[PDB]
Design a binder for these strands. Structure first.
Lengths: 135, 77, 97, 356, 101
RNA sequence: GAUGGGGAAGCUCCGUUUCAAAGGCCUGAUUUUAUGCAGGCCACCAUCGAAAGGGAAUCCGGUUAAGAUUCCGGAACCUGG
RNA sequence: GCUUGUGACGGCCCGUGAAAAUCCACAGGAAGGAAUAGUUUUCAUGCCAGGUCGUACU
């Protein structure tokens, strides 16, 4: 089948967020007026949450667990696809073609995506996603 | 030496309060190759560098001489 | 033999040559079979395995370099990887190659 | 171990809704006479409205497949010169010059003969029969999507923005010669806006991060503004030419006093969401910001041209009424040329008139 | 016809001790000692000059701002970009192969 | 070419990081012994040897019987705080 | 055109043609910072300081 989907996790290869894991929300199949190529809307995380342990408590744990999200449009060539998957319904209506451009609507999108990804991480599920890829 | 284009930025440097002295300068030049015109150059002595402002029109030049503060020293040619 | 199977597919059947054009056909899910050369580097090869096993596409390893894979498909330029979009009259995919 | 808003009247309630569009209203423009509002919408139409009544008086369908996500009506603006009836419309990779049949012979013929007289980065084409029936008089076809268009004050030149078109992200078009030129050799960033100065021979170019001011006569950069934002969305220039405002997607409005410093003179934080438009009144000491929170904020600004005092900026009014749709609110706004009246374009399919 | 001296007390043509002949406002030729040319910084892997980094003498990097010396990608200052690409691809596949083992 | 060492009746000779205890950094109510230092971290080596190798940064104009990239006038830059 | 500086190439070897001070970057994340005011002196401007010896002329 066509494997790039709304579930799909991937590693971004080029441009600033290189070696940072993202999840695809809206795959455009072929092209538009801007972005004349096969491109996906994605929603990754820029700064990974640091390690955390039995020793730390309360305030030190809140500082350690904090995540910066990002959102971007990206080419299919620059995305390396991955067998893992993540559920995307918390930020379906947020991220979209209308949402990109017209700033600072981008900032209001990231606040919802922050509240998704941290809250996904508390009671941790998809453990591979929130670990940093080391290279 | 450092040229400035903008007129607002020049008025900030005069009120900066390290600038002890300024100097005005007048030059005869020919526009295109049609006729002569009377250029001016408002220079101001900063501590590090010499900031300057080239005004081509003679009408705008004469209002700019008045628009300097009186407490600042000004020196002709 | 493998050269007799591939001599059919070139003359009557859809195909594509080289790395960038194959990976698109793996992404889109058109490729039924891919043929990777021996002498291609291992990071290139191990990437094409991973793209393939997501898509569930069969992967054959040609015993032979990229020059003589080009001779097998019948092109005078060398070719590292070849993909089959549609099967020819002969069966190719259902055999063990 | 500072004056109160009460002392700063007039400023704009919503008296009138322009109802009819079936999709987001992305762009609007008021004609030189101050009587006719034009709007452009994702429903694929441009409409013209009688401003005091809200009566739609004209409609032309420029996109037959309005459900197409690839291209839309992006930006429209009436030609600023009086009595030629010309409306410029950027849609997809094209610019149409339209003369609607609502003004009569003296005005419409003036526009049509101006456009016909002129009879490779852009191509100027006679309209097809289909395009004639849409009241298109000429089309300028560019290589990339045209997101922004703005007329020079004299109504012959206009500048357009094609983001991510490299060296041709900014194009200057001249109607009288059917000539398109790329004024720049170098592409610096993603271009968001381009506007001619109100009276000086200058072009202001807004990228995502900076505003660069070029002297078109000297052919040189004369100033570079540093707003301190990552995502600028629009600029406007004060009518007396020495101040600028800039909106940003990160919720800020920046006021730049161009002679004072290259950094913002004042940072205004009056929006909860991305700011999509900033607009000066051409005659009254007013300006506005419009944002994705569905709100418009109205400000007073006094500028002191001659004396050593910096601008006095006073917030006046928060205008609410537009509905937030898919995280979008007010997409565009424009002041009436004379009255303290503001027109807004909404993601909610409406345009609205705000009055005293 | 007009001829020109070394300004400094070294009279030999060493790598350091080079000259450009320059016309002055006085209206006579004069020597000016040119400093030695900056080579490009390299990528310490693929072995080639790497973009968006200034060519300066090694002390002169201390004067200049951060955005000159860096680029914004991870491993940006010190990698080819294409060679950063490879090791992100490689790290991901070998780490995935380790679970298959 | 000192030192640690080893030769030599001895003037001294070998050797140069070598069979040396060859210093300088972090933490501490180190939780009780009630007025005494406890727990750790780091790892090679003095010095001399280039007015042509390596190397932070200054230019124009003026001036003296005889001096100037060093004085005078203006215009720059570098290092450290 | 002459002198010279530099660029991208080509030839040559059983020859493949110094080192160290110094400076910068990258990976790492010890930890440190805000909502009533902090963090940035690798952005800008501003303040202070710069010793010893050689310097004529052939």
């Amino acid at each position: 089948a066509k494997f790039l989907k709304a579930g799909k996790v991937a590693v971004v290869v080029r441009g600033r967020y290189a070696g940072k894991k993202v999840v695809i929300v809206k795959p455009h199949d072929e092209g538009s007026k801007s972005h004349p190529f096969g491109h996906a809307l994605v929603a990754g995380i820029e700064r990974y949450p640091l390690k955390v342990t039995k020793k730390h408590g309360a305030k030190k744990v809140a500082k350690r667990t904090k995540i910066k999200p990002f959102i971007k449009v990206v080419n299919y060539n620059h995305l390396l696809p991955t067998r893992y998957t993540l559920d995307v319904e918390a930020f379906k209506s947020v991220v979209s073609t209308e949402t990109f451009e017209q700033p600072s609507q981008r900032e209001e999108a990231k606040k919802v995506v922050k509240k998704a990804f941290e809250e996904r991480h508390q009671a941790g599920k998809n453990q591979w996603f929130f670990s940093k890829l080391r290279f | 030496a450092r040229e400035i284009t903008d007129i607002k930025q020049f008025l900030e440097l005069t009120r900066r309060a390290d600038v002890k002295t300024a100097t005005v300068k007048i030059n005869k030049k020919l526009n295109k190759a049609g006729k002569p015109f009377r250029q001016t150059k408002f220079k101001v002595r900063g501590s590090s560098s010499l900031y300057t402002l080239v005004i081509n029109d003679a009408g705008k030049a004469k209002k700019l001489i008045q628009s300097l503060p009186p407490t600042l020293k000004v020196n002709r040619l | 033999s493998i050269n007799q199977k591939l001599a059919l597919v070139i003359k009557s059947g859809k195909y594509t040559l080289g790395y960038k054009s194959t990976v698109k056909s793996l992404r889109q899910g058109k490729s039924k079979l891919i043929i990777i050369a021996a002498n291609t580097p291992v990071l290139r090869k191990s990437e094409l395995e991973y793209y393939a096993m997501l898509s569930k596409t069969k992967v054959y390893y040609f015993q032979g370099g990229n020059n003589e894979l080009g001779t097998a498909v019948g092109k005078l330029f060398r070719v590292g990887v070849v993909s089959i979009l549609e099967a020819g009259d002969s069966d190719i995919l259902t055999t063990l190659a | 171990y500072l004056p109160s808003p009460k002392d700063l009247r007039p400023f704009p309630r919503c008296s009138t809704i322009y109802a009819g569009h079936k999709g987001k209203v992305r762009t609007l423009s008021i004609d030189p006479s101050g009587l006719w509002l034009a709007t452009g919408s994702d429903d694929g139409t441009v409409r013209v409205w009688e401003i005091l009544t809200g009566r739609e008086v004209y409609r032309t369908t420029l996109i037959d497949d309005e459900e197409n996500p690839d291209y839309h009506i992006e930006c429209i603006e009436w030609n600023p010169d009086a009595n030629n009836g010309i409306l410029a419309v950027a849609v997809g990779e094209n610019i149409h010059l339209i003369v609607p049949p609502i003004f009569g012979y003296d005005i419409e013929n003036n526009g049509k003969t101006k456009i016909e007289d002129g009879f490779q980065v852009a191509q100027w084409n006679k309209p097809s029969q289909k395009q004639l029936e849409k009241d298109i008089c000429i089309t300028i076809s560019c290589k990339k999507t045209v997101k922004k268009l703005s007329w020079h004050r004299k109504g012959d030149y206009f500048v357009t923005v094609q983001p991510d078109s490299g060296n041709t992200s900014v194009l200057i078009h001249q109607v009288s010669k059917h000539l398109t030129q790329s004024p720049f050799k170098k592409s610096k960033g993603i271009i968001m806006d381009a506007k001619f100065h109100p009276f000086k021979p200058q072009l202001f170019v807004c990228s995502q991060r900076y505003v660069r001011i070029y002297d078109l006569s000297q052919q040189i950069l004369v100033k570079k503004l540093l707003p301190g934002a990552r995502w600028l969305s629009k600029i406007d220039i004060h009518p007396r030419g020495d101040n600028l405002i800039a909106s940003s997607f990160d919720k800020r409005v920046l006021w730049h006093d161009l002679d004072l410093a290259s950094t913002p003179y004042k940072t205004l934080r009056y929006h909860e969401k991305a700011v999509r438009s900033v607009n000066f009144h051409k005659k009254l000491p007013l300006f506005s910001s419009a944002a994705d929170d569905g709100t418009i904020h109205v400000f007073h600004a006094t500028v002191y041209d001659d004396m050593m005092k910096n601008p006095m900026i006073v917030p006046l009014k928060k205008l609410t009424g537009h509905k937030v749709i898919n995280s979008l609110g007010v997409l565009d706004a424009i002041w009436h040329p004379r009255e303290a009246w503001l027109f807004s374009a909404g993601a909610d399919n409406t345009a609205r008139l705000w009055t005293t | 016809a007009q001829r020109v001296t070394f300004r400094r007390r070294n009279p030999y043509n060493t790598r350091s001790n080079k000259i450009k002949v320059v016309k002055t406002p006085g209206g006579i030729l004069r020597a000016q000692h040119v400093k030695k040319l900056a080579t490009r910084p390299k990528c310490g892997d693929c072995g080639s000059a790497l973009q968006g980094i200034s060519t300066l003498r090694p002390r002169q990097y201390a004067t200049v701002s951060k955005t000159h010396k860096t680029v914004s990608r991870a491993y940006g200052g010190s990698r080819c970009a294409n060679c950063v690409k490879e090791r992100i691809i490689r790290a991901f596949l070998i780490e995935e192969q380790k679970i298959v083992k």
